[model samples]
Target: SNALFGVTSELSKDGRERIYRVEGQLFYASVEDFMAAFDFREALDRVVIDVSRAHIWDISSVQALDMAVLKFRREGAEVRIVGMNEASETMV
Candidate 1:
């Protein structure tokens, strides 16, 4: 329960891809917290956000996630969601 919802990002070895690992519970409280986390990237060939370890608890989080994805797309980068589990998928 001590786990705080957030994300960790890194560049791939090729340097064209940015990978973000989202962990812990992601809900309304995390919508803004993680939104800023993705606000830091641009000019990338690809953005990979892997949420296999995290869970989206509400529609707020889903909107936040969608915003993040479209922002990068608007900036001309490819944003890809690796895998979304059923729990998080259910929320979607």
Candidate 2:
């Protein structure tokens, strides 16, 4: 169950870029528990974040999102989170 939280990247567009997707249920405890697996600086260089299954269930996880978003954007990559659920859309 724990191994499911890490970020995984898939090749996109002829290997020029990676489409990074965050899988599994994301809560504060879950995110914190899995944060180490997401060393955004090292795992990827150019990426597109696919947060299709992404969930923002509570305040703690929402508050901790700044670094995650910043790290992905700061490295000259485009991160787009798609397929948000009702709760996630409402939270955003």
Candidate 3:
């Protein structure tokens, strides 16, 4: 399988607080890879998404983004997104 092109994640800490961020470049391709990326972020207590490169298509298949969004908020942490273009902005 073509492991979904342009998906990468990284982590960093702000002072004492640790922050993990997942940045992926997605397209009309592998759904499994995108889901896996989402699942991986679930492991962390908090995360910030830099979906700058993420080119989202029909997310209706994955249901809603509530679960993922709530996960970070429930931890008393913040989840923010940055640098989204027209392609990404339109989808969201």
Candidate 4:
């Protein structure tokens, strides 16, 4: 509502966007959606986040994303980003 960071996720199967740059600012920010998505679908499967479409900002997102990843896995589902963006490559 405040920022225009729309998390365009397409999981439960597949998604879009992937690694295509060196910027980690926006990539980190996108984790917000993933955190929720992972929590939403915390029932099972390797939940995928379209990391390719967003940009990471900082390590703060690592916790957001890392926590979600762990939470998603602990709940039953595993974590696997759809795009090999800086987020997937950096924080991972």
lDDT of each: 0.78, 0.60, 0.47, 0.49
Record all residue pairs in model 2 with backbone atoms less than 3 Å apart, i.e. clashing.
Answer: none
- Candidate 1 or 4, higher TM-score? 1
Model 3 per-residue lDDT tens digits across residues 11-54: 55533233334344344455555555554334454566555554
Query: Can you give the TM-score per candidate against the true fold?
Result: 0.84, 0.61, 0.51, 0.55
Clashing pairs in 1: none
Clashes of 3: 0
Candidate 1: list runs displaced more than 4 Å: 1-3, 86-92
Residue runs of model 3 more than 4 Å from their true location after superposition:
14-32, 38-46, 61-66, 85-92
**Residue 26 displacement (Å), model 3:** 4.0
What local lDDT score does residue 42 receive in model 4, on the 0 to 100 scale?
34
lDDT of 1 by residue, 1-92 (tens): 22577688898788788999888787877677778788545568999889888878888988888888888888888888876764386574
Order the candidates by lDDT, highest first — what do you get? 1, 2, 4, 3
Query: Over the stretch 38-87, how does candidate 2's per-residue lDDT look in tens digits?
Result: 55664454656566766666667665555566777787666654554532
Rank all candidate structures by their TM-score, best first, as comma-separated numbers: 1, 2, 4, 3
Task: Tell me the lDDT of model 4 at 2.
Answer: 15
lDDT per residue (tens digit) for residues 5-92 in model 4: 5454343444321211122244454665444433344344556555564555567775665575566667666556556554445453
- How much does each candidate deviate from the true structure in C-alpha RMSD? 2.6, 3.6, 4.4, 6.3
* Candidate 1 lDDT score relative to the true structure: 0.78
